[PDB]
Structures are given as C-alpha cells and as structure tokens.
Amino acid sequence: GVLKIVKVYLAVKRRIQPGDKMAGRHGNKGVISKINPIEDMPYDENGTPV
Amino acid sequence: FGIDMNTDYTLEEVGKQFDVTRERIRQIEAKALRKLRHPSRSEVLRSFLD
Amino acid sequence: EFLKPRLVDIEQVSSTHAKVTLEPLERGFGHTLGNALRRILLSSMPGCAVTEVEIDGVLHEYSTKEGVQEDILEILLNLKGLAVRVQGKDEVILTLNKSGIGPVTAADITHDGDVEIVKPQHVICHLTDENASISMRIKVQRGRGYVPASTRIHSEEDERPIGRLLVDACYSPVERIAYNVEAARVEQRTDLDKLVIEMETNGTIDPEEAIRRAATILAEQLEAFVDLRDVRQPEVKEEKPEFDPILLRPVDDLELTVRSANCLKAEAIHYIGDLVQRTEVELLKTPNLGKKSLTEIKDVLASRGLSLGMRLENWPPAS
Amino acid sequence: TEFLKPRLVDIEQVSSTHAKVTLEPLERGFGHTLGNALRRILLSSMPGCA
Amino acid sequence: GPEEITADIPNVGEAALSKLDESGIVYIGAEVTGGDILVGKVTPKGETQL
C-alpha cells in the first residue's frame, strides 16, 4: 500500500528549565524549581557565587 | 446558491421570477459579489479562508 | 547634613582583575553601596559578543568540516567566549581566513579601526591537512545581559541565510565581583570606612569606565523614586478599524515575480493599500511594465479577493 | 545601553503615619537592589530627633 | 487514489514554501520550529460537497 517514505531527522537542543528531574549519585532526587540570577546567588568573601 | 433554500436555481430560472430577465440578473450577481468583495464588508467573510 | 564618596586608587594587577577603592564612606554605607553595586555590576553592564556566524562549507551546527578536528558545534561554542571590544560601531562583521596545518588563533582575524582582540591567543579551531582552508563571516553585536540563541527567532521575516549559525549571546564582561569594606580612618573623623571592590573582567572594560556606568543606572532608577506621582497610563486603545487589515500588509505577501517586485519599490508602493488604488492607466507609464509584465499583477490580487484601482476616502489612519 | 524605568505606582495609605506603595515594572533584580539599599537608608541613616 | 509528495499544497502561502524545495522536502540545515512543514503531502479526496 505504500509508495514512498520520507524520514526527516531533527536535532533539537534543549536547555534546562523548571520541571527537569536531577539527582546526585546518592539517591538525592530533585526537580529544578526556579532558575535564579547570578546577582541573587549566595557568594563568599571572594565573591564567587554558588 | 443553496442558501436557506432547497436546491439552487439556474440563473435563467431566477430571471423569470422577477419579470426583468436574462443578462439583467447576470450583472446584479457580479455587482453583489463585487460589493461583498472590498472592505467594511470584505473583512468579516475573509477570515473564514485558511 | 551628609558626606559623599569618591574613588581613590584603582589598582590593576592584571588585564582581567583589579581592586578599585572608594575612600569617603560613612558608617554602614560600605555594605550598602557595596552590595547594591555588585548587583548592578554582575548584571546590567553593557557588552559585545558574537551573535551570528556563517562558515565556508558548513550547513548547521551539527556537521564536520573536512580537515578540521573540531565540529561546527564546538567552534560556535568557542566563539561565544571570543573577547572583543569595539567603539563607534554597533554591529560589525569580522572575517577569518587561514590555511595549513595550524592552530587558528584570534590574532588570525582581520583588523578594523574599532576591533581590539583583547586576547589574540584564544583558540578558535585547529586545521589539520596541509591545504585544508576555512573562511567565515563572524558577526558581533553589542547588547545587555544574556540573549540566548532561541529567543533570537521570533523577529524572523526572512533570516533564511542557512549558513548563519546563531550562537548563544553572552553580552557581558563581568565574570565575578567581590567587595569587602575594611574600616579606614581618615586622620580626623570618628569612624568612616573603605570599600575595596575587587573585580574580575573579561578584559574589555577598564574598571573605572564600568563602576561609573553602574552608578548611572542606579540614579535613573532612583530618579523615579524621589517623588512618587502615583502615575498610571491612558489605556483604552481604539476598537474601530475601517478597511480590511489586508491593506496593511507589505507587497511581499503578494508572492509576485522579481521584475514586478522591484517595480513597486520604484513607483513608491509598499503597503497594498496603494497597489489597491492604482489603475491600469497608472501602469504602462511605470518603469518596465508591459504586456507580459502586468498580467502578473491582476492575478495575485484576484486570489486574495481584491481588485486593481479603487478608492477609500481615508488612507491611512490614524496615530 | 538604555534601561527600563517603572510605570504604574499606587500608594495606598492606611492612616497618615503608615503607607503601602506598589511599583512595577523593574528590570530583573532591580526590585531587590533598590528595595534592600533603600531599606538600609530608611532604617540606619535617617535624620531624626529623639 | 495515490498520495503525492508534491509541493503543491491547497491554501498555503509562500511563507511555508520557503523552507521547502521544488520537490516538496525541507532543506537540510533549515532551523524550523513548531508548525513548519517538513514534507509536503496530499491525499486524494474529491467532490467535497460543500
């Protein structure tokens, strides 16, 4: 029943946004909740944010 | 057109029903379409086309 | 009854890194201006960084140039960090050319009177086959903060250049900021304080230039803060369009032939609210329209439902 | 380059001594920077007689 | 009848047929988003009876 077929391959580049499940190797799951500005991040006396 | 009527009528059928017949009715149509063709009027019906 | 600070020694220690000091500070303003400056230094600073890039024989980020050992996706991600500084211009398209088994550094670009490659060793890619050769049109703009690649297609309207690979835009030259107020007693004063703002640039802002344009914003923001006029907006826009909106789209949408496409540029007709009102009379006397040339225009106006040459005693209203 | 300065600001005051002001739309992070920096000056370094 | 992969698609503008070649297949390298046509296709359905 089929004459000819076209397969298109897409390369989507997905960044990361609230909702994605992430976890360390020790069974600590977690779903990124807000993506914060570098301005608001905890920093140390050397200024380097976390 | 079949607009709120059963069947649609040959343009001659329409002419006898008005006693002024023939080429006469064939122009009223085109001008009516022509009337609904440009704006104020055109705007609303246009949007139905996809 | 107050004081005011100023900036004494700005002490570079590298192109990238310097401690600028602000001496006349009252009790506690140290941490007050100190935190509120880091906030405006880490974000709102102006910066230029590469926006689009076209490369010789490559069609998308995900391919492989012959005789190079990076992939287009990697070369783009190398350009994101190419640190340039330009002056009078706002968007400048640099050109890159080099052949032969050899690291293509940042120095291998071509110079423009405004282009200063603040780090010319910066690796872009490596060639690897004697007569392998690349060429690219790198385009740098200058904006504020972080405009990621994706959001840079909604303005579309023919960005078609398949070659142009867009890179995420990191328009900023702050890397990391850190203040510490150590107490500083000018010989006589009860207790004033210092403010060492240690900072880490990419090389393309001289500390003083920055910290000035930082304080500037704070003013314009605080400008509206001084008095509070309860201000609001007019609103209630207009709900009466006369004509059919179709007469507000450009003549491109008509999908016509090239000899007829430039010809409505010529005789001054962009929106089709003017093509709508120009009769066949008007058309033989227009540059380059004939028997074959004008049959084309009466057919794409038919399909959309308009005609050639009519009126509308009110074009175009009204703002 | 050029910046964003707010619009729509409604001071709804309860009693003459107390008042509640809302003021949008600030750039990203500009609520906290203006907010905190103004809190410090209102609280710590404000001329008065007690 | 048979389905054709032709680029002749009823009631679509050139805005669509830009990312499509003469044959009806999307070009390699075209950055597309939701809604853009990857492969033009048409199925035989005659006499609609509108």
Curated annotation (Swiss-Prot), chain B:
Segments of the chain annotated as binding DNA: 11-30
Segments for region (Sigma-70 factor domain-4): 1-38
Known outcome of mutating R34 to D/E: 2-fold reduction in activation of class II Crp-dependent promoters
Domain notes: Contains 4 domains, connected by flexible linkers. In the active conformation, the domains are in an extended conformation, each making extensive interactions with the RNA polymerase catalytic core. In the autoinhibited state, sigma-70 factor domain-1 packs closely together with sigma-70 factor domains-2 and -4, contrary to the extended conformation that is seen when the protein is part of the RNA polymerase holoenzyme.
Family: Belongs to the sigma-70 factor family. RpoD/SigA subfamily.
Biological role stated in the UniProt entry: Sigma factors are initiation factors that promote the attachment of RNA polymerase to specific initiation sites and are then released. This sigma factor is the primary sigma factor during exponential growth. Preferentially transcribes genes associated with fast growth, such as ribosomal operons, other protein-synthesis related genes, rRNA- and tRNA-encoding genes and prfB.
This protein's name: RNA polymerase sigma factor RpoD
Organism: Escherichia coli (strain K12)
GN (gene name): rpoD
Curated annotation (Swiss-Prot), chain D:
Post-translational modification note: (Microbial infection) ADP-ribosylated on both alpha subunits by the phage T4 protein ModA. ADP-ribosylated on only one of the alpha subunits by the phage T4 protein Alt.
Highest taxon in the source lineage: Bacteria
Subunit structure: Homodimer. The RNAP catalytic core consists of 2 alpha, 1 beta, 1 beta' and 1 omega subunit. When a sigma factor is associated with the core the holoenzyme is formed, which can initiate transcription. Both the N- and C-terminus interact with different regions of transcriptional regulator CRP. The rRNA transcription and antitermination complex (rrnTAC) consists of RNAP, NusA, NusB, NusE (rpsJ), NusG, SubB, ribosomal protein S4, DNA and precursor rRNA; S4 is more flexible than other subunits.
Function recorded in the entry: DNA-dependent RNA polymerase (RNAP) catalyzes the transcription of DNA into RNA using the four ribonucleoside triphosphates as substrates. This subunit plays an important role in subunit assembly since its dimerization is the first step in the sequential assembly of subunits to form the holoenzyme.
Domain comment in the entry: The N-terminal domain is essential for RNAP assembly and basal transcription, whereas the C-terminal domain is involved in interaction with transcriptional regulators (such as CRP) and with upstream promoter elements.
Protein family: Belongs to the RNA polymerase alpha chain family.
The protein, known as: DNA-directed RNA polymerase subunit alpha
Lineage: Bacteria, Pseudomonadati, Pseudomonadota, Gammaproteobacteria, Enterobacterales
From Swiss-Prot, chain E:
Applied biotechnology uses: Co-administration of salinamide and rifampicin or salinamide and myxopyronin suppresses the emergence of resistance to both antibiotics.
Cysteine pairs bridged by disulfides in the record: none
Changes after translation: Acetylated on several lysine residues in the presence of glucose.
Family of the protein in this entry: Belongs to the RNA polymerase beta chain family.
Assembly information from the UniProt record: The RNAP catalytic core consists of 2 alpha, 1 beta, 1 beta' and 1 omega subunit. When a sigma factor is associated with the core the holoenzyme is formed, which can initiate transcription. The rRNA transcription and antitermination complex (rrnTAC) consists of RNAP, NusA, NusB, NusE (rpsJ), NusG, SubB, ribosomal protein S4, DNA and precursor rRNA; S4 is more flexible than other subunits. In pull-down experiments interacts with CedA.
Biological role: DNA-dependent RNA polymerase (RNAP) catalyzes the transcription of DNA into RNA using the four ribonucleoside triphosphates as substrates. Resistance to the antibiotics salinamide A, salinamide B, rifampicin, streptolydigin, CBR703, myxopyronin, and lipiarmycin can result from mutations in this protein.
Protein name, UniProt field: DNA-directed RNA polymerase subunit beta
Residue numbers of the full-length protein present here: 846 to 895 of 1342
